[PDB]
Ligand binder design. Sequence first.
Ligand SMILES: O=C(O)c1cnn(-c2ccccc2)c1C1CC1
Length: 289
Amino acid sequence: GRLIYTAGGYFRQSLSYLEAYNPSNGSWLRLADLQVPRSGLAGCVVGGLLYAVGGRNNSPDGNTDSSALDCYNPMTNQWSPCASMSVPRNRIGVGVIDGHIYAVGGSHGCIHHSSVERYEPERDEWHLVAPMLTRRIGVGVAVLNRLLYAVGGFDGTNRLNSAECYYPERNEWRMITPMNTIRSGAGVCVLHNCIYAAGGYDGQDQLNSVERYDVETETWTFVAPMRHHRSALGITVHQGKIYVLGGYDGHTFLDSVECYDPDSDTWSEVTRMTSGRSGVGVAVTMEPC
Ligand SMILES: O=C(O)c1cnn(-c2ccccc2)c1C1CC1
């Protein structure tokens, strides 16, 4: 697409912001608020529509985990409700395969989900699939070669360096090589043939380290670290580069947006969000009207 969309997030309370960043010219646009404030959600794009999935409304009025799926049409600049998931999923991960959205893990109160469900836009309907082998909240999710990966997170008792892979034609989950680092609330994405895991929380510290999984060799290798330690960051890929957005560094809710160039193995700061925040959902699609 053309723009990096950031939805929701958290600073003092859950937020309703939708804003879109244009890497070509450095500009930010403020777009139509989410109907319901939510942090800990995930964003993804199917057929040019942007989707916001799950999360939680942390508010003075109270705290409500979200089963919601909402859809934003850049042409109209309007949000519409879509079918809700079977269960609320705060701190969810999502991935898209063959036009279908997979919702993975997340929490509902003290329940840490291993369950997974799949949305079909053509029918506006969700169906459960096989659960992960591990309960995971704050899980990173990415798709590569039409396989779905769940990376890290928190199972209820321990933060995790473990990861696993879902094979749709077999409806089966299998463990892959674990990361070299425990990461909960990291940013996970795909670039070229590798699954990237940036930042997160290892139980004691927010991380600036980044590592990547080569599906051919099944090994994790560290690359250059981010300039800022971050957990609960947003992440996405745009024209061959990874962008990380916001997060919490142990002291400040970050407005920093960093960009990773894999040919030079360097990060640089490319812009700042209009306000520091963590727990955003991020995806890339066309510019609005
Ligand atoms: O502390 C954890 O283990 C954990 C689990 N999920 N998330 C999270 C993930 C996304 C958004 C907000 C929070 C966290 C904290 C960010 C570290």
